[PDB]
Amino acid sequence: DIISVALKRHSTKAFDASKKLTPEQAEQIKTLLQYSPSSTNSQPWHFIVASTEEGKARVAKSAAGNYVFNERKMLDASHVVVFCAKTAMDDVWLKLVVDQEDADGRFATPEAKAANDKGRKFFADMHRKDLHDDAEWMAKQVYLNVGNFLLGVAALGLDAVPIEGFDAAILDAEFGLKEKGYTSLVVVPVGHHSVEDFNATLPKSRLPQNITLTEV
Amino acid sequence: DIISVALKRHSTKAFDASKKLTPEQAEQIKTLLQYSPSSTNSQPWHFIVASTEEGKARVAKSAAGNYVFNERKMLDASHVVVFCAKTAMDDVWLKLVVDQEDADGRFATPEAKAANDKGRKFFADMHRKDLHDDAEWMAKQVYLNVGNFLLGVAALGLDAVPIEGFDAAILDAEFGLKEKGYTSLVVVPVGHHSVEDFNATLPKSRLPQNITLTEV
Numbered sequence: 098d099i100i101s102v103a104l105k106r107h108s109t110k111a112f113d114a115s116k117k118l119t120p121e122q123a124e125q126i127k128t129l130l131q132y133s134p135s136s137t138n139s140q141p142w143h144f145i146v147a148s149t150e151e152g153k154a155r156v157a158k159s160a161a162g163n164y165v166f167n168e169r170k171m172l173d174a175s176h177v178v179v180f181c182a183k184t185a186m187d188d189v190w191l192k193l194v195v196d197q198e199d200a201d202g203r204f205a206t207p208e209a210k211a212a213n214d215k216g217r218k219f220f221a222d223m224h225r226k227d228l229h230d231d232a233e234w235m236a237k238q239v240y241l242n243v244g245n246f247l248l249g250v251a252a253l254g255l256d257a258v259p260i261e262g263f264d265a266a267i268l269d270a271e272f273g274l275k276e277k278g279y280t281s282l283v284v285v286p287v288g289h290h291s292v293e294d295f296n297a298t299l300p301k302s303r304l305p306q307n308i309t310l311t312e313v
Numbered sequence: 314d315i316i317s318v319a320l321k322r323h324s325t326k327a328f329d330a331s332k333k334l335t336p337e338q339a340e341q342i343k344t345l346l347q348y349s350p351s352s353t354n355s356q357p358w359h360f361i362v363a364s365t366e367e368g369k370a371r372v373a374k375s376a377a378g379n380y381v382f383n384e385r386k387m388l389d390a391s392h393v394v395v396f397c398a399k400t401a402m403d404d405v406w407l408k409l410v411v412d413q414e415d416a417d418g419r420f421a422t423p424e425a426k427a428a429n430d431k432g433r434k435f436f437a438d439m440h441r442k443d444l445h446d447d448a449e450w451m452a453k454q455v456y457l458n459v460g461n462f463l464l465g466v467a468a469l470g471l472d473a474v475p476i477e478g479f480d481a482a483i484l485d486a487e488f489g490l491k492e493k494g495y496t497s498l499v500v501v502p503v504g505h506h507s508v509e510d511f512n513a514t515l516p517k518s519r520l521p522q523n524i525t526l527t528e529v
């Protein structure tokens with residue numbers, strides 16, 4: 098039951114470095130990242146999946162500064178996912194997306210494909226041209242991917258923690274992201290908690306629905 | 314299996330108005346909204362859940378004008394969730410959150426509670442004082458809730474569609490949201506698809522991992 102998964106998952110504070118994802122789970126987490134929904138199927142994202150000691154150490158340099166409490170989590174987890182957003186929405190990317198929708202068989206006609214593209218360009222143009230907020234818009238889609246991911250990995254039986262406490266400038270510099278048209282937003286270590294994970298045995302806490310929720 | 318759910322879920326384009334959530338499912342979707350993670354457990358959100366004909370019609374007013382293709386989804390679904398973000402992060406809210414964490418039993422000591430609050434205020438202040446991006450930050454947390462929600466409701470056996478194609482100004486005006494300190498971001502109708510849902514039988518399309526995903 099998915100509600101059980103939602104009530105029992107927790108942000109892991111310490112990982113067991115000896116406990117790896119199975120090779121199958123390593124495929125499955127990639128499936129989760131790929132198949133997340135996004136506004137217009139824009140998919141304005143890149144993922145770095147660090148599973149080696151060298152890879153994880155490159156990521157963990159971003160947990161300099163006031164972010165040392167997060168450094169261990171990045172080193173000790175099995176797999177570490179960096180969620181990145183595109184920095185700008187370009188026409189090359191929009192063509193890639195609609196051509197993929199076509200290859201996958203989503204259009205009965207050429208007309209239907211043209212209309213999909215006109216629809217997507219119109220909607221994207223609203224963000225880059227009029228509102229000038231396309232970076233924020235694309236970032237939101239990435240956070241949506243994260244949310245999907247966290248419940249997904251919980252449902253697979255894996256521990257994880259979302260991390261905003263890192264220096265994106267360091268991480269971007271380390272993987273040359275700016276030059277490739279991306280910026281890091283969230284880091285998610287995935288694995289199995291250790292005995293040092295104090296949050297594993299703490300009760301979960303949320304505001305009551307009588308504050309956060311209205312029915313009409 | 315959650316990977317099946319991820320591969321088979323789809324944005325519903327048409328709902329069957331005669332098919333309601335069971336009383337139990339109506340509680341479960343609320344549990345999903347409530348128990349989503351958020352940066353610092355800040356929970357900077359409000360949900361409107363419209364299940365009556367009057368309520369759903371009020372929401373659907375936001376889809377008149379240029380967004381008519383989305384209007385019928387909001388009218389015909391069983392339950393329609395409006396995801397709202399806070400417009401500003403205030404100290405009253407931060408106190409509410411940490412006091413709830415305390416009531417739920419997450420602190421062994423007064424010291425531990427003080428440290429949690431200092432930690433959260435420090436991190437929040439970084440967004441409101443420096444950066445001046447706390448609206449964007451809070452909105453991202455809400456999108457993360459959406460991502461969690463969409464996989465959740467799919468895993469419960471329910472159909473849904475995320476909607477950004479609505480007029481937030483109209484929706485905010487209709488529920489007096491600005492005055493209460495919120496803004497609408499995403500509308501999610503939940504229910505069961507009708508035979509008019511052309512997207513139910515279309516193959517899913519994603520960009521290949523050799524573009525979106527790097528391993529290290």
Ligand SMILES: Cc1cc2nc3c(=O)[nH]c(=O)nc-3n(C[C@H](O)[C@H](O)[C@H](O)COP(=O)(O)O)c2cc1C
Pocket residue numbers: 106107108110167258259260261262263283296301349350351352353354457
């Ligand atoms: C976007 C985001 C950023 C977070 N950043 C961190 C972080 O840097 N360090 C950390 O220990 N936890 C981090 N958390 C975990 C949250 O504090 C956590 O989800 C919240 O306290 C509720 O805990 P739960 O995940 O156990 O339900 C983050 C959560 C989210 C959603």
Ligand SMILES: Cc1cc2nc3c(=O)[nH]c(=O)nc-3n(C[C@H](O)[C@H](O)[C@H](O)COP(=O)(O)O)c2cc1C
Pocket residue numbers: 132133134135136137138241322323324383474475476477478479499517
């Ligand atoms: C944030 C967001 C906004 C969306 N807005 C709309 C919308 O206004 N109308 C609509 O029909 N679908 C909307 N969609 C659905 C997307 O087109 C869809 O997720 C994408 O094509 C992938 O297909 P799938 O959701 O069936 O996996 C939205 C999706 C998301 C995540």
